[PDB]
Design a protein around this ligand. Sequence first.
Ligand SMILES: NC(=O)c1ccc[n+]([C@@H]2O[C@H](COP(=O)([O-])OP(=O)(O)OC[C@H]3O[C@@H](n4cnc5c(N)ncnc54)[C@H](O)[C@@H]3O)[C@@H](O)[C@H]2O)c1
Ligand SMILES: NC(=O)c1ccc[n+]([C@@H]2O[C@H](COP(=O)([O-])OP(=O)(O)OC[C@H]3O[C@@H](n4cnc5c(N)ncnc54)[C@H](O)[C@@H]3O)[C@@H](O)[C@H]2O)c1
Ligand SMILES: [Cl-]
Ligand SMILES: [Cl-]
Ligand SMILES: [Cl-]
Lengths: 314, 314
Amino acid sequence: NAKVAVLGASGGIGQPLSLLLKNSPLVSRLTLYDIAHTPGVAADLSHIETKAAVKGYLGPEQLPDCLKGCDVVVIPAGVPRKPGMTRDDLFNTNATIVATLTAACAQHCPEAMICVIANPVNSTIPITAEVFKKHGVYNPNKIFGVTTLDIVRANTFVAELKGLDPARVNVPVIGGHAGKTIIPLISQCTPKVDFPQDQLTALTGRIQEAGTEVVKAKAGAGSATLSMAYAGARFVFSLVDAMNGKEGVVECSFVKSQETECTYFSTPLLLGKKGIEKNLGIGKVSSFEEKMISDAIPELKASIKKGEDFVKTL
Amino acid sequence: NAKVAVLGASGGIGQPLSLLLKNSPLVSRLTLYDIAHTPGVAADLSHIETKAAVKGYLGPEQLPDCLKGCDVVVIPAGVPRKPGMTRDDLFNTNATIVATLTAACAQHCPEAMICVIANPVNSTIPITAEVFKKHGVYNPNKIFGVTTLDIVRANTFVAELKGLDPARVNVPVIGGHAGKTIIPLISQCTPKVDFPQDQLTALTGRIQEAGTEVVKAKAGAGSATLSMAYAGARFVFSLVDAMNGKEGVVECSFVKSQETECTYFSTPLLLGKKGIEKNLGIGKVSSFEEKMISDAIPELKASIKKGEDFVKTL
Ligand SMILES: NC(=O)c1ccc[n+]([C@@H]2O[C@H](COP(=O)([O-])OP(=O)(O)OC[C@H]3O[C@@H](n4cnc5c(N)ncnc54)[C@H](O)[C@@H]3O)[C@@H](O)[C@H]2O)c1
Ligand SMILES: NC(=O)c1ccc[n+]([C@@H]2O[C@H](COP(=O)([O-])OP(=O)(O)OC[C@H]3O[C@@H](n4cnc5c(N)ncnc54)[C@H](O)[C@@H]3O)[C@@H](O)[C@H]2O)c1
Ligand SMILES: [Cl-]
Ligand SMILES: [Cl-]
Ligand SMILES: [Cl-]
């Protein structure tokens, strides 16, 4: 019976994400929002033989109605990268978008789980938090920077190298969602996997640079869409399952954190009826992994600060 | 398990269809083909943590390697309607696309199930048949015009009207895939539903005009994509399960037929290891349904001849 909104539903991520959500018996109502094309996307999805009632909304006049009653809001709304761009190069465009949409969430569904996909995630989650604080409704257990694609990628690449079924592989990925802030904890992988350091370093780089490589492959036609839909829906399903009282649901996500000096940071989170039930910690890590954590922290702090500073201007 | 090719994989249907297939444990290898953008789509999908190996192919020089060893080929390749168009306005452009692609299938994977989505289905199926005959490999039990979206719509619409879970509703839909040739057998719906004739005729028109409704709603940005991804995947899964020896698998599809004087016709089909096991036929129909079938026959015969006449020009 979960009521889920997708903001940016007409986009590259939004459309297949909305499909996966409509296909799920976990979703009773699916409200779709965008500044273009949403009615057509809703009409299309509405024909699918599943229970979720689909409704489309177009333009800021209609946004409040999309949000009212929502249990979960997912926000792919934003501009994606061109080849040669960094995720930070998106900040100046996507800051405003996220700020405006999350302000609407704060006003119209302040109790919803808020799942931000729009890049750069390392700054857009701090923006969300500070927007919520401005409206007097910040709950740090309910705001999530979606990093699931990093984990999905780690699982796939590990499985490939060891000839495993990726369905049975779970790699914790910590830190943030840009470059060297993406920290895959291969030492914590299940099943246990042994790589010599040369191969381990290559694998870790491949995980870190995976998004950039898809941008390159699409040659100007955007970034990861279909695999993000997959990863985004996974995260939403875990969240909703947890909200329905399912036990033992764990996902990595970039959240308000006191695991390091960074005020936001991704670790495995036990999910529950209230959102974050418990931050499970970084855990025991290798020397290689500890140095990566150490190396990432300055970049993460700078990105958090940039987001916070922007909301100060609003 | 199953080796599936998607011809037209970068399109509105092709991408989310490819996602749904990648997500499925029934699929061991997914080969993607298009004249544009395929390498990036394959890169994106290859990151999802499921077993299917994904490989992208671009342009006709690469089409044979996409097709070799395939068990199923799905063909969403073609141009979609704009508002105001009939499906036959697509004939000149799609007839050639389908002829060329099915000719490559006939040559490189003649044993595969061929699942045609491209419109107008009522003509593109006969095209495929005559191309396969031209190559001396026509098997009538392995060529399918995908009408599943008409069934999916009927289930959803009946479920809405009767306050039922659409997951449990099954309406047989027969005839063809255009306008009045789409014939919903509400009299054979499970569970049994009683509509007065006024609601029945309205419901039946809604089903018939549903595609046009979605083209209208999208207002120039294409036709049904996400719902067709859903319906195409459904069909492909039914086929594959049947291929793996699952019993009692029935799907309606536009196929070579002797049920009526139309040489191609959609009825419920029992699927098995060789494609079509048994055409279950029209069955018992109401007077209202009998008249629809009767009125449809001329249009269907003219569409069949149109496709056949086209292959004569090659
Ligand atoms: N977190 C991750 O792992 C991850 C992965 C891939 C992409 N991304 C990011 O997700 C974002 C979306 O990517 P995409 O490929 O869908 O791009 P897109 O350009 O294809 O779609 C963006 C959609 O957002 C909409 N939009 C823009 N401003 C809006 C507003 N103010 N209100 C409502 N809707 C608005 C657009 O109309 C469009 O439909 C990008 O910022 C991208 O970098 C994140
Ligand atoms: N059977 C049904 O119920 C049903 C439902 C909806 C749409 N359709 C039909 O499906 C077709 C696809 O619609 P869409 O929305 O994906 O359109 P689309 O225009 O978005 O995508 C079409 C794709 O086909 C590709 N393509 C074109 N020519 C090709 C060729 N010669 N070889 C390989 N690929 C080629 C394009 O490059 C593009 O990637 C249309 O004809 C549409 O009417 C059928
Ligand atoms: Cl980056
Ligand atoms: Cl917290
Ligand atoms: Cl009836």
